[PDB]
Design a protein around this nucleic acid. Structure first.
Lengths: 531, 28, 498
DNA sequence: CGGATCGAGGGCCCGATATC
DNA sequence: CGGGCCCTCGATCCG
């Protein structure tokens, strides 16, 4: 009932990993930070996926395949099994950088042998290897053809993590943009990179190259779980247009606010047990006198202005509105312009896909998607997940991409939900109208603080601060503190790790560019507090 | 400051609106 | 802010009980039903509003200063179920008879004394009267045309009321030979011509307003920090908010009075109330148990400080339509806290609209709360022909999802329809075309909820059934496109369906 | 200065489910 | 045996 997966993290711990470039944390500390981030999510989220850890270039050989002189300086620190706190504690402080250097492809072979032996009996749905190296070490091209063949036959996916990104000044880890020294790369690193590129292309085609990340960017993304992320649970319905016309669909939640999975159980400070604490509800009169009111004598009531009318839950269930329970019923069609994004309601976005293994419904839905797209129109629909759920009215707009095709449902508001207030006009506020110098100062501010650059010459604007790619800092901050308390109970909570601040702040180039226009607008725009 | 109810009718500062809609069809 | 005061003044002269248009209710019946409709609408839109019902031209006089022929049926007070029940005793022809029996009709009155009593009714209110309004329901276009003194004194007192701050609105009803404003009511009313039929305004008054509308509430007043030194103050307003079913109140079986609930936490071993210092929070993962104090659980929660932090300016094209997380907010400046905020806000709005770019910020609503990236989309002011602000000027705070909030998608094989099927779906869309309004649909659960409470309050056995607007007009749709529907169904679905 | 609102708890249905 | 929904309380700020 759950997506399982065998993950083997292959970390370079060689002396050169300890070799650090000024200002920048050593690739050893960078890889350690990324690995800890991954294991932390798998540990605290309690995923039933098994994780193994192989280190290459450590002093000595835990002989995982070292039948002779082969695969030296490779230690299998953790065999494929569910991750625990002992593993996190080992990563945090026990694992130290080694002095030797190993062949990253040899380490990849050790990882592959772990997957080949510990996955027996279709226990795992997905197989994945994550290599963490700097490529500064020399290597042999001897079994690359076999490595690729064994990876395909075993259906194992790869992911590479280097200190530099595929593409100077100060450098801040997790920041956007300058997150790797432009100069400093060795010809040995270039050669290793060319081999990495070829291997990724041989496994996942042209788009395989997108799976080669830098430690910095890896920290401000969820790409490390990409291959082991469990697919979202979809549910079926019928899009009913009128009478006689219908379409078998299956919709899932496209966007949904990810919240804390674990709940805080209240325990006693001394015993640390739930059993000792109990909450009892007491009834007392609303009136100045709080004599105890009998729990059984309490009757349900509702207010009708001044009057308070007693309406029991029994009569409520009978007299209440009974929903027809029909889901995704189409009410009508209107132009795209009539539905404004400001009226979107709810806490979810639904992606209405065509029922799986159904060709007639797939074409029936595709026809509507393309008809709405070509006419530049949308569909006003009635939706309810069950007869018990309150009915909703929302927008269903087309969404065609090169790979997939679907309709996107977003709940719209009811007359009662809408709120009409009157705000003072500013267009013609004689008192607040800004001068030409003030407007050209804001003009310089917006131009200097722009978060988008257009790649090539006229190509599409490349966004420099994609927030939708940055993970919610709540989770990795919580995992940091939870682990610190589990390992260091005597010590108080640690401060927010700097890379979290670096990933949340805009690229250094934007902050530096804004310096001058911000200083001009400070003097041009007078600010004083009201007291 | 500025405080004109305008066409708010019974609830001042709150625009009053027609309650109907949803079945008005243009004849293409 | 304020509680609004509304006084319904009804004429009780002989002319009011004769209906003009045959087979039509008397102007009095129209008034009584209109008043009742307003009372019910008010028990939904705003319960704190104070209403009053005053009659004039009646033989029996009941009023503060004992002015002849003025019967104050209802003093200024909140709307109630029994007040509507009292008005229902005059609704209809039989109710008209009940009115003539309880109190007289067609008696000589004096509009000067009538407006004085109404003003004296506002005098006796203690709470903030935000709006003072009198709605005069009458069908006599020239009442004291015969008496010159009563007419001039009434004109003088009407001026005194407007100088007080009282609004005077006329609800002119059907009069033989038309209703003339120029003769009377033209100068008294607070600001057409001949209006022989009942004031059109009656259709709106008569129409029930089942809406839970609330006085403007700034949700929060935060600091918009452009930079460490440049900080303006802005107000965050929720212009759209899902209206939900009011929570029930726990009463008593006999007295039917509200009961206050106190949810107390105490020990099992000891039995006495436990202090919050003696409590700790725990989370157990497998075998390990992590212990954190309530303060520590909030300290990890702190993250960014409360306020808006300007990140930069992202072009609107980059903001995708499918990236909605939670309902958008409205950002407007708050000159009350920081003076000069509105000027910079106006300059920012103007230049953002010019450049078609949104202001990216790091939103932290309260202390010890993790931040969220929001995009302030420049919203321009829009005024209709009536000079009504259809879209206020400011920024729409659009919540952007984090990597966690974007859910992975189930990879499906792309199967594209033939141009014949899409052009044909185009024909269905073209035929089912309609005009969308934001206020087109009403919540059927709420509409039924308040219709049920109204009917139970009026002791009406029959509950008032709201027609569900959210259901599609199936039969109308089948009438508009029957054959086309069978044709496409034939084109895409084969007869051996699953 | 009580409401209005929103995080984070709690309680009822419904497809897989070892079960006769 | 989980998943979605919805409501009820509890804590935070504004009117």
């Amino acid at each position: 009932s759950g997506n399982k997966a065998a993950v083997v993290l292959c970390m370079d711990v060689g002396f050169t990993m300890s070799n650090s470039i000024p200002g920048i944390e050593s690739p050893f500390e960078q890889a350690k930070k990324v690995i800890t981030m991954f294991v932390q999510r798998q540990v605290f989220a309690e995923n039933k996926d098994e994780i193994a850890l192989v280190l290459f270039g450590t002093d000595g050989t835990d002989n995982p395949l070292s039948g002779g002189d082969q695969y030296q300086n490779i230690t299998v620190h953790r065999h494929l099994m569910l991750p625990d706190f002992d593993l996190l504690e080992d990563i945090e402080s026990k694992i130290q950088p080694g002095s030797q250097q190993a062949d990253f492809l040899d380490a990849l072979i050790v990882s592959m042998d772990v997957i080949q032996h510990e996955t027996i009996g279709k226990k795992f749905e997905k197989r994945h290897i994550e290599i963490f190296t700097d490529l500064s070490s020399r290597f042999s091209k001897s079994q690359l053809d076999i490595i690729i063949h064994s990876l395909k036959k075993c259906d194992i996916s790869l992911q590479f993590f280097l200190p530099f990104s595929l593409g100077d000044g100060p450098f801040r880890l997790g920041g956007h943009g300058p997150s790797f020294p432009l100069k400093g790369i060795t010809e040995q690193q270039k050669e290793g990179l060319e081999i990495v590129k070829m291997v990724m292309i041989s496994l996942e085609g042209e788009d395989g190259l997108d799976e080669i990340y830098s430690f910095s960017e890896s920290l401000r993304k969820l790409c490390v779980f990409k291959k082991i992320e469990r697919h979202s649970i979809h549910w079926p319905c019928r899009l009913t247009i009128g009478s006689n016309l219908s379409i078998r669909i299956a919709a899932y939640k496209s966007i949904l606010q990810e919240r804390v999975k674990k709940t805080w159980t209240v325990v006693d400070a001394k015993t640390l047990k739930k059993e000792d604490i109990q909450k009892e509800t007491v009834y007392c009169l609303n009136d100045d006198d709080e004599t105890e009111v009998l729990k059984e004598d309490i009757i349900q009531g509702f207010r009708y202005g001044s009057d308070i009318v007693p309406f029991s839950k029994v009569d409520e269930e009978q007299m209440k509105y009974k929903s027809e329970g029909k889901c995704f019923s189409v009410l009508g069609f209107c132009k795209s312009s009539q539905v404004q994004r400001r009226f979107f309601m709810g806490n979810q976005v639904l992606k209405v896909f065509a029922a799986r293994d159904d060709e007639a419904a797939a074409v029936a839905l595709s026809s509507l998607i393309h008809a709405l797209d070509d006419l530049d129109m949308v569909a006003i629909v009635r939706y309810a997940y069950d007869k018990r759920a309150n009915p909703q009215v929302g927008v269903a707009f087309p969404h065609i991409k090169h790979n997939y095709e679907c309709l996107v449902y977003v709940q719209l508001p009811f007359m009662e939900d809408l709120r009409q207030y009157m705000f003072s006009s500013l267009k013609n506020s004689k008192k607040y109208a800004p001068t030409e110098a003030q407007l050209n100062a804001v003009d310089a501010l917006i131009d200097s603080m722009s978060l988008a650059k257009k790649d090539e010459k006229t190509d599409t604007l490349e966004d420099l601060f994609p927030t939708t790619k940055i993970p919610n800092p709540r989770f990795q901050r919580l995992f940091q503190c939870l682990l610190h308390r589990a390992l260091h109970p005597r010590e108080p909570l640690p401060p927010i790790q700097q890379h979290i601040w670096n990933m949340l702040n805009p690229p250094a180039e934007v902050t530096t560019k804004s310096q001058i226009p911000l200083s001009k607008i400070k003097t041009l725009f007078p600010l004083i507090e009201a007291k | 400051r500025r405080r004109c109810p305008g066409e708010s009718l019974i609830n001042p500062g709150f625009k009053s609106k027609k309650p109907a809609g949803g079945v008005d069809f243009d004849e293409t | 802010s304020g509680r609004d005061s509304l006084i319904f003044l009804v004429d009780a002269s002989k002319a009011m009980f004769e209906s003009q248009s045959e087979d039509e209710l008397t102007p009095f019946d129209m008034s009584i039903q209109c008043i009742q409709s307003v009372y019910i609408s008010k028990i939904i839109s705003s319960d704190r509003d104070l209403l009053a019902v005053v009659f004039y031209g009646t033989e029996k006089d009941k009023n503060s200063v004992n002015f002849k022929n003025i019967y104050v049926l209802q003093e200024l007070d909140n709307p109630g179920a029994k007040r509507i029940l009292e008005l229902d005793q005059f609704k209809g022809q039989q109710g008209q008879k009940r009115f003539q029996d309880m109190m007289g009709h067609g008696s000589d009155y004096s509009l000067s004394e009538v407006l004085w009593v109404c003003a004296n009714l506002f005098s006796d209110v203690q709470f903030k009267m935000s709006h003072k309004r009198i709605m005069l329901f009458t069908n006599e276009d020239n009442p004291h045309g015969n008496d010159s003194a009563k007419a001039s004194r009434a004109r003088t007192k009407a001026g005194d009321l407007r100088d007080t701050g009282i609004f005077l609105d006329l609800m002119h009803l059907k009069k033989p030979g038309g209703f003339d404003i120029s003769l009377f009511y033209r100068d008294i009313i607070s600001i057409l011509r001949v209006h022989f039929e009942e004031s059109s305004k009656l259709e709106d008054l008569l129409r029930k307003v089942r809406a839970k509308e609330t006085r403007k509430r700034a949700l929060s007043r935060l600091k918009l920090k452009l930079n460490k030194d440049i900080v303006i103050s802005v107000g965050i307003y929720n212009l759209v908010q899902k209206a939900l079913k009011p929570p029930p109140i726990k009463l008593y079986r006999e007295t039917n009075e509200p009961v206050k609930t106190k949810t107390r936490t105490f020990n099992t071993s000891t039995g006495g109330l436990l202090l919050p210092s003696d409590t700790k929070r725990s989370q157990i993962y497998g075998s390990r148990q992590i212990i954190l104090e309530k303060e520590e659980t909030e300290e990890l929660k702190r993250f960014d400080d409360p306020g808006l932090m300007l990140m930069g300016f992202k072009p609107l094209v980059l903001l995708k339509k499918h990236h909605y997380l939670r309902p958008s907010l409205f950002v407007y400046p708050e000159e009350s806290l920081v003076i000069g905020s509105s000027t910079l806000f106006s300059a920012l709005l103007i230049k953002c609209l010019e450049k078609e770019v949104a202001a990216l910020c790091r939103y932290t609503p309260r202390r010890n709360i993790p931040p969220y990236f929001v995009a302030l989309v420049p919203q321009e002011e829009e005024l209709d022909d009536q000079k009504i602000q259809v879209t206020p000027p400011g920024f729409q705070l659009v919540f952007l999802p984090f990597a966690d909030d974007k859910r992975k998608m189930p990879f499906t094989e792309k199967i594209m329809a033939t141009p014949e099927q899409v052009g044909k779906m185009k024909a269905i869309v073209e035929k089912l075309r309609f005009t969308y309004r934001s206020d087109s649909f009403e919540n059927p659960v709420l509409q039924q909820h308040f219709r049920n409470l109204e009917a139970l309050a009026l002791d009406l056995m029959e509950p008032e059934q709201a027609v569900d607007l959210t259901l599609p007009k199936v039969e109308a749709m089948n009438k508009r496109l029957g054959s086309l529907v069978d044709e496409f169904k034939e084109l895409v679905y084969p007869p051996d369906y699953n």
